[PDB]
Write a protein that binds this ligand. Structure first.
Ligand SMILES: CC[N+](CC)(CC)Cc1ccccc1
Ligand SMILES: CC[N+](CC)(CC)Cc1ccccc1
Ligand SMILES: [Mg+2]
Ligand SMILES: [Mg+2]
Ligand SMILES: [Mg+2]
Lengths: 317, 328
């Protein structure tokens, strides 16, 4: 009747941190989004109660104000894309991103103008590398989530390959590069790829752990890693939570074993790499903090559950 | 017949690092110390084989060469203290400590000829050190070193009279007798931390958890020789067996968990300090970085040195399994 969500981040070295502009950033991004009147009534309640501004302000806590605002707009845009969610539709979004100063046709879905004004504002605080990184990764995200949604698992490892692109971590990480100029030889260095990949997988586990209760009550858990593990390893729910707790521990341990062992390029690259890795580590904390403080997964019991870990299995809806 | 030393640092973030000036510091420091002829023949060989310069150079791997040299002198001085304090007890400790402290307070006044040589060894150690240690660092060393000197004498007196300890109370004593607190003062060589930043409760906690891991590591390594000479009475391995009524295998697992809990508290909090702005924030970060590297440095030295495992420590470091020495 109840299951114990493992305390995977109990000793994680990055503490919960909140951007000081949360309140302002929240009120601005909410206004910018909601002036388009583009959410249904059901969606508006979700948008508000999920507080993607909180998610963003936790993730970008140590970043400047205007980037934090971009992060707020990005998280809200993720919702907009979901809510308004094929090749022509995504090509509208990409074309707005590619041409921020181009007037969007009057007979086009409003996501084109929302995407445009988002990027118009973003390029005022994301340097050219961060810009280039976001456009590349965001396109891959859109194709992964939208264009391939129709056609869309052998095992858990093949789920994690697809989910590394559908969760949207990679475009969110581009904002960490706002005032960085990491050359391709640094960003794709094998150790840094490993650290990034381990953080993304930890993000995946955490979100599936927290969405699982609601998803199973509705029969929507087919792609949740909890369910996938149960089927692959022939184990119950409690055994699945232990298995995923172990899997998360191995990832965290690999990160801890390595994140201070990056090689040295000289300055200013070494300081960039250090701050970028700080941003990866804080991302794992921020996602988890938000997953419990938000209404999204636990409604109004999340803070209690974060401390106590026991969750009541919801009955079939 | 054989115990397993827990792989306490398998996941520790700080990698082994060695000061690039190791060989020069080692040679100058060993010559400085050996010219006093303060060691018995057996103690001269041990001083050489243990190579306390390697310990200093691992722990101070990221510090300037001259500060690294001070660290080598300090690690060698601790051995001098261990060798010479053996003649002292609770009745002579204050006059004995005051000889050393008078030397540190006055690094330029040669000591009288009728006084134990540890005064002059301490004096010339400090005469060199004050050229690269700033005033907060100097003040921090003077204060913590004095406490350490009383503590080692008193601890030897308590052992001699079989004063009782359990796990928690042993740890309280050992935090002061291990010598980590004066050693940390060198980390402040070019810092000026205000008293309320240095004594901030989280920084105090981080230092304490660091020191406690250092204690556990050292006792795990020294246990084998200690238990074979019945000298393991105040060895956490023995204190755990007694306090918990468990066997060696059980005690090793208990200590593993105890180390894990300290490591988790340290990792959980090392990036949780409040902010005072610059240059106070950079100092705190670099200070804590030195605390994190000390844990690795102590461990690396404990296995590479001759001090605990002779020439077998690199195998033990890899395999963890150790054959119980028979009674000596
Ligand atoms: C809104 C997207 N997401 C994905 C877990 C909630 C479903 C938050 C998020 C986005 C990007 C990276 C990490 C988390
Ligand atoms: C382990 C090294 N030492 C030196 C006195 C005994 C050999 C204890 C110690 C450990 C850590 C820091 C300072 C001293
Ligand atoms: Mg999920
Ligand atoms: Mg000693
Ligand atoms: Mg010992």
């Amino acid at each position: 009747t109840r299951f114990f969500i493992p305390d995977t981040l109990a000793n994680w070295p990055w503490p919960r941190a909140l951007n000081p502009a949360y309140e302002q950033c929240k009120a601005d991004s909410a206004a910018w989004c909601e002036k388009y009147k583009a959410f249904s009534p059901k969606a508006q309640k979700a948008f508000n109660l999920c507080d993607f501004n909180l998610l963003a302000s936790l993730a970008y806590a140590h970043l400047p104000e205007d980037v934090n605002r971009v992060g707020c707009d990005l998280m809200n845009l993720f919702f907009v894309v979901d809510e308004h969610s094929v090749h022509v539709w995504v090509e509208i979004i990409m074309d707005a991103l590619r041409n921020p100063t181009k007037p969007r046709p009057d007979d086009e879905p409003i996501v084109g103008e929302i995407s445009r004004t988002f990027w118009e504002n973003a390029i005022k605080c994301l340097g050219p590398t961060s810009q280039k990184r976001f456009i590349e990764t965001f396109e891959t995200y859109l194709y992964a989530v939208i264009v391939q949604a129709d056609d869309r698992f052998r095992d858990v490892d093949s789920y994690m390959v697809v989910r590394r692109d559908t969760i949207g971590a990679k475009p969110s990480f581009a904002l960490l590069e706002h005032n960085m100029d990491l050359p391709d030889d640094v960003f794709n260095h094998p150790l840094l790829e490993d650290l990034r990949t381990w953080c993304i997988d930890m993000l995946i586990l955490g979100n599936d752990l927290c969405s699982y209760n609601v998803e199973q009550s509705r029969g929507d858990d087919g792609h949740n890693i909890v369910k996938l593990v149960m089927l692959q390893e022939n184990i119950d729910l409690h055994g699945a939570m232990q298995y995923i707790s172990d899997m998360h521990d191995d990832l965290a341990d690999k990160f801890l074993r390595n994140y201070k062992n990056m090689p040295s390029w000289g300055q200013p690259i070494d300081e960039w790499v250090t701050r970028y890795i700080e941003g990866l580590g804080n991302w794992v904390r921020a996602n988890d903090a938000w997953s419990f403080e938000s209404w999204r997964y636990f409604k109004y019991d999340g803070l209690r559950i974060q401390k106590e870990r026991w969750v009541e299995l919801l009955p079939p809806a």
